[PDB]
Amino acid sequence: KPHRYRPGTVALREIRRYQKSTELLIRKLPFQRLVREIAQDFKTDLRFQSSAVMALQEASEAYLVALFEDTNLCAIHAKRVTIMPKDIQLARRIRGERA
């Protein structure tokens, strides 16, 4: 019979592996395309240095990781294990970002 792990083991393994390392997690080209499309609205025919795109990517990733940590704490506070959109909304509301 095929050997299967119980649901939950691979999640913890991925947690350990991914917070042991220090690389980026989003593919570079789609992020660059998104940045260009977002900036197109404000001014036409713009140009970007590579280091600017790198800095934007790093800042966005750090922000998202911190927000996800806060969301996990909010989810645990209510005797649950799965995160849900209401947890994200509550975290953003308490942080003072959402009006």
Partner: protein, 111 residues
Amino acid sequence: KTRAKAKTRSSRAGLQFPVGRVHRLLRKGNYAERVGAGAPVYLAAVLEYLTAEILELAGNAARDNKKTRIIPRHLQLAVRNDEELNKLLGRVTIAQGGVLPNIQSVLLPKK
């Protein structure tokens, strides 16, 4: 009329950071009309102390993992494990830093 050999102002105070550069930056930085003769020495000493402390901690972290060079991960580990330094750099992100290895206790496997 024989001018004496020049001696750096940093050497008189027994420091390593440049006193004269800091004095010029203070004068040209639009902070006040005039700048006293004792502020640059104080500023240089303070900056030197902070740099030495952070470097010592980061070097210890690097030696821990059997390496002879310092990389941004070692700086992040050094900063985030000390409460006072963590308080100082509360709202600062370091590139290529990562995060501390923690897991919530409830999520751990039962039995």
